[PDB]
Design a binder for this molecule. Structure first.
Ligand SMILES: *[C@@H]1O[C@H](CO)[C@@H](O[C@@H]2O[C@H](CO)[C@@H](O[C@@H]3O[C@H](CO[C@H]4O[C@H](CO)[C@@H](O)[C@H](O)[C@@H]4O)[C@@H](O)[C@H](O[C@H]4O[C@H](CO)[C@@H](O)[C@H](O)[C@@H]4O)[C@@H]3O)[C@H](O)[C@H]2NC(C)=O)[C@H](O)[C@H]1NC(C)=O
Ligand SMILES: *[C@@H]1O[C@H](CO)[C@@H](O[C@@H]2O[C@H](CO)[C@@H](O[C@@H]3O[C@H](CO)[C@@H](O)[C@H](O)[C@@H]3O)[C@H](O)[C@H]2NC(C)=O)[C@H](O)[C@H]1NC(C)=O
Ligand SMILES: *[C@@H]1O[C@H](CO)[C@@H](O[C@@H]2O[C@H](CO)[C@@H](O)[C@H](O)[C@H]2NC(C)=O)[C@H](O)[C@H]1NC(C)=O
Ligand SMILES: *[C@@H]1O[C@H](CO)[C@@H](O[C@@H]2O[C@H](CO)[C@@H](O)[C@H](O)[C@H]2NC(C)=O)[C@H](O)[C@H]1NC(C)=O
Ligand SMILES: *[C@@H]1O[C@H](CO)[C@@H](O)[C@H](O)[C@H]1NC(C)=O
Ligand SMILES: *[C@@H]1O[C@H](CO)[C@@H](O)[C@H](O)[C@H]1NC(C)=O
Ligand SMILES: *[C@@H]1O[C@H](CO)[C@@H](O)[C@H](O)[C@H]1NC(C)=O
Ligand SMILES: *[C@@H]1O[C@H](CO)[C@@H](O)[C@H](O)[C@H]1NC(C)=O
Lengths: 194, 596
């Protein structure tokens, strides 16, 4: 036991990222221990699809990707393979044969302001659905009419719509922090387990 | 691409913006209501102005999509609601004049007071002392003086204001496509575009009249009974066959006959069902009352309250410098926020009021999934009936015995049931003719069939015709009697109560039948049954998406109002009243007048 994979940086990072511009991390060439995840607060959802949660230390991989963002409480069910919805097909799409685990826990105390937290945005309009593991950052005036826009106005909207968080909101609208781990095989030495 | 999608995108954006703005406004209003300070008033005014302006510009933008190219039958309702409730057509000067008139009327009504004769030091107000004097004082002259003084002091000032107000309202309504402002109110029940469920504005009036024709006997019998009892109280003044004087109805206007229970009790020897002493002995408090109400609501299968409800709601009077209004209200601030405001005492009335408010809260919580513009009751009467049936079913001896407040040795018989039925009838049955007459007169004056110089005349004629009440002192056209009422002066519709009074009984009979209860209807409890709760929840979750006729058919299997459940409920009292009125004349003659 020499090198420990950093799981104290993905989790416990003060501020996360907007869902429409989610963050990606690469973990490799270290001994990964999954017992540190259970040291946190109870999780709203702990679902593992491709592998059993208990047998995570018996098989291992070559690369592990950690994706983190913040969404509403009732949109957690949309982070799953074969799901349809706004946030599912416009911001973050998962393949049907996805193998990994999804973590989500309440973060009301850290991501709420009395005046309002307007520092989280999500995409509301798009011309076409998103391919799996694709991101879109360009912000152009979305057109919904035959006439060209040439500026924001009627029938032409700003694609991004902002959240607003207050501590007095009920559960189901309060912020939730989500971490998605991914595993894969490829023709290369694994070197990531322990 | 097409008009429908262009409208759908706009609706999608409006749905997310309006929720945040409405939440800000509601939070400001709540913060002011629970805590009265000048800064709270300023914040409330700012939030209201922002919300009104935003609705104005959104309604202005909504005109781009014509309504004849949409067949989805759900987007159309949202667009129609936006256009209806955000449009302005009058000129700026006329709008300013109307706002000034409304504010002047509200201020005059709120600050109205009467000063004691030969004692200018003390001037009585309406809420603190006038209502108490009307309810409790047994002096004929004192009651007559208070009635006449209030009518003169709040009617003479508001008559020209009401004339200008009705002229402006008729002008605004005719500016729109409606015939007049009364049509504008009656349009709330209009349903179009669905086969087998269409409802026109002109139908409603007929329905109302028909229902009244089916309820005239019972009421008049009750009226006769009360008259006899009042003849036993004041022997000289009341004519044997004349109409009752207006100032002896137990309140200012005669809306309710509840205050007459003490004088007209059928059997005073029998003990009354009271649980205040039992609650005091068992050391109850507000939290226990609300927990019991929550348990009752759980017993039918409906979901119970959230943590935020308990943490944020206030259930006791703060006291000290903290001043707040103690009128019980149910707040739906949005974004999953529900609260109740009520200054609670350890009394049976508060025990029932807790259930009444939790019913409203449950109905608000039911349709949270619907779009923003459809999160409302089917019409203006469904919400009231849904709130009232819960209090209807929670005041039965069986429920109290199950809870444990009532002694198990208590038993029911003839006189207890008769007293309970008369107590309920003095509150429910009495207000229907008053409400019907007021709405009919207001519709007539909006139509223009009554010229101004005859207004009061016609009004008093109807008082002698329908309600059977005669004025104590003749009044000329200088007075404005109807404007004294709170709803009349503050521009509120007055037909929701009439529809609620029937919807509640229809719902109660349907739910009791679903629970397979046996026996008299007035002794029915649905605490443990789940089929009734399931049917009620199925109705509640709809929201405004479906027409009210379809929801009523889904619940009770009928497409219109019916008075049969009410008569079935009140039949045991009706038979006793018919038996008792054998030696008393039934009916009144309008020719008799107290002032010769
Ligand atoms: C479209 O625009 C219209 C305005 O034209 C909006 O209509 C309002 O709708 C609401 C909800 O239906 C109405 O609210 C109701 O007001 C009644 C009037 O009460 C007055 O008097 C009491 C004192 O007696 C005051 O406390 C109160 O503040 C009012 O000044 C209330 O009596 C009603 O309360 C009922 O429900 C509560 C629970 O919510 C129960 O606890 C009560 O016991 C009671 O059963 C109710 O609050 C409001 O009056 C309407 N406005 C007008 C001008 O009529 C629409 O909302 C809007 N549509 C939108 C925005 O979509
Ligand atoms: C009138 O327009 C409304 C608004 O679009 C239509 O409601 C829509 O109905 C479809 C099909 O029932 C809904 O699609 C569903 O989406 C969920 C994901 O949210 C998915 O899991 C389901 O399998 C289904 O595909 C759609 O959400 C719904 N729209 C809204 C805003 O709720 C309605 O069908 C239209 N009616 C007519 C007669 O055209
Ligand atoms: C009731 O309202 C008053 C004023 O509207 C509140 O007093 C303010 O409280 C905030 C935070 O507590 C202070 O920042 C302000 O300076 C106070 N204003 C004044 C004029 O003193 C009061 O806190 C409210 N009551 C409660 C229980 O919150
Ligand atoms: C609904 O269910 C409750 C729960 O069993 C019943 O409450 C019982 O009531 C009887 C009196 O009839 C008491 O002797 C029991 O102790 C109560 N049990 C509990 C657990 O509180 C209630 O009676 C039922 N409703 C009706 C109408 O019978
Ligand atoms: C992150 O962890 C550090 C130390 O482990 C702690 O001091 C800090 O409060 C944590 N912050 C959050 C948001 O969990
Ligand atoms: C994304 O992750 C990188 C790598 O840790 C970090 O430097 C950056 O601050 C993150 N950005 C956001 C918006 O979280
Ligand atoms: C009622 O509230 C309690 C909390 O005291 C909760 O445990 C219970 O699940 C709620 N009822 C239902 C039907 O969920
Ligand atoms: C009183 O109850 C008895 C029960 O035997 C019944 O015969 C009688 O008609 C009742 N009388 C009244 C006035 O309710």
């Amino acid at each position: 036991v020499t090198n420990l994979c950093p799981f104290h940086e993905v989790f416990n990072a003060t501020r996360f990222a907007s869902v429409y511009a989610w963050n990606r991390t690469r973990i490799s060439n270290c001994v990964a221990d999954y017992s540190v995840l259970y040291n946190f607060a109870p999780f709203f959802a702990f679902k593992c699809y491709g592998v059993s949660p208990t047998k995570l230390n018996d098989l291992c991989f070559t690369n592990v990707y950690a994706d983190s963002f913040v969404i509403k409480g009732n949109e957690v069910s949309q982070i799953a393979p074969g799901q349809t919805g706004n946030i599912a097909d416009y911001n973050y799409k998962l393949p049907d044969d996805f193998t990994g685990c999804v973590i989500a826990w309440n973060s009301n105390k850290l991501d709420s302001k009395h005046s309002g937290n307007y520092d989280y945005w999500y995409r509301l309009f798009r011309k076409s659905k998103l391919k799996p593991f694709e991101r879109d950052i360009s912000t152009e005036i979305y057109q919904a009419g035959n006439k060209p826009c040439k500026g924001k106005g009627p029938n032409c909207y700003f694609p991004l719509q902002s959240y607003g968080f207050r501590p007095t909101y009920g559960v189901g609208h309060q912020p939730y922090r989500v971490v998605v781990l991914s595993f894969e095989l490829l023709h290369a030495p694994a070197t990531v387990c322990g | 691409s097409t008009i429908e999608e262009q409208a759908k995108t706009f609706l999608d954006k409006f749905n997310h913006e309006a929720e945040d703005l409405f939440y800000q406004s509601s939070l400001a209003s709540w913060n002011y209501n629970t805590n009265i300070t000048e800064e709270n008033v300023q914040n409330m005014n700012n939030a209201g102005d922002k919300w009104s302006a935003f609705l104005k510009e959104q309604s202005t933008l909504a005109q781009m999509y014509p309504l004849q190219e949409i067949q989805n039958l759900t987007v159309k309702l949202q667009l129609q609601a936006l256009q209806q409730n955000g449009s302005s057509v009058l000129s700026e000067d006329k709008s300013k004049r109307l706002n000034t008139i409304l504010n002047t009327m509200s201020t005059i009504y709120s600050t109205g007071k009467v000063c004691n004769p030969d004692n200018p030091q003390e001037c009585l107000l309406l809420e603190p002392g006038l209502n108490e004097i009307m309810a409790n004082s047994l002096d004929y002259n004192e009651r007559l003086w208070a009635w006449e003084s209030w009518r003169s002091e709040v009617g003479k000032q508001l008559r020209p204001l009401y004339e200008e107000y009705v002229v402006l309202k008729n002008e605004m309504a005719r500016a729109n496509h409606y015939e007049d402002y009364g049509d504008y109110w009656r349009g709330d029940y209009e349903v179009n575009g669905v086969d087998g469920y269409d409802y026109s504005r002109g139908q409603l009036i007929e329905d109302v009249e028909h229902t009244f024709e089916e309820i005239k006997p019972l009421y008049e019998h009750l009226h006769a009974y009360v008259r006899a009892k009042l003849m036993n109280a004041y022997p000289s003044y009341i004519s044997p066959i004349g109409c009752l004087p207006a100032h002896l109805l137990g309140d200012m206007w005669g809306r309710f006959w509840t205050n007459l229970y003490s004088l007209t009790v059928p059997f005073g020897q029998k003990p009354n069902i009271d649980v205040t002493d039992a609650m005091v002995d068992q050391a109850w408090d507000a939290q226990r009352i609300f927990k019991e109400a929550e348990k009752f609501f759980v017993s039918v299968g409906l979901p119970n309250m959230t943590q935020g409800f308990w943490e944020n709601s206030m259930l006791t009077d703060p006291g000290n410098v903290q001043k707040a209004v103690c009128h019980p209200t149910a707040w739906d601030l949005g974004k999953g926020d529900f609260r109740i405001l009520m200054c609670t005492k350890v009394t049976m009335d508060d025990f029932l009021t807790a259930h009444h408010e939790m019913g409203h809260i449950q109905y608000d919580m039911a349709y949270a999934a619907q779009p923003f513009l459809l999160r409302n009751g089917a019409n203006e009467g469904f919400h009231e009936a849904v709130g009232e049936i819960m209090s209807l079913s929670a005041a039965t001896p069986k429920h109290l015995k199950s809870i444990g407040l009532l002694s198990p040795d208590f038993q029911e018989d003839n006189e207890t049931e008769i007293n309970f039925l008369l107590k309920q009838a003095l509150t429910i049955v009495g207000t229907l003719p008053f409400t019907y007459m007021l709405e009919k007169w207001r519709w007539m004056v909006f139509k223009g069939e009554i010229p101004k110089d005859q207004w009061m005349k016609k009004w008093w004629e109807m008082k002698r015709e329908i309600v059977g009440v005669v004025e104590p002192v003749p009044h000329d056209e200088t007075y404005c009697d109807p404007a004294s009422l709170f709803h009349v002066s503050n521009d509120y519709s007055f037909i929701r109560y009439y529809t609620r009074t029937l919807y509640q009984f229809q719902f109660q009979e349907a739910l009791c039948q679903a629970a397979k209860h046996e026996g008299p209807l007035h002794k029915c409890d649905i605490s443990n049954s789940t089929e009734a709760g399931q049917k009620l929840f199925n109705m509640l979750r709809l929201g405004k998406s479906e027409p009210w006729t379809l929801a009523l058919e889904n619940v009770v299997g009928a497409k219109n109002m019916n008075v049969r459940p009410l008569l079935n409920y009140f039949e045991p009292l009706f038979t006793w009243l018919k038996d008792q009125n054998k030696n008393s004349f039934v009916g009144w003659s309008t020719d008799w007048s107290p002032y010769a």
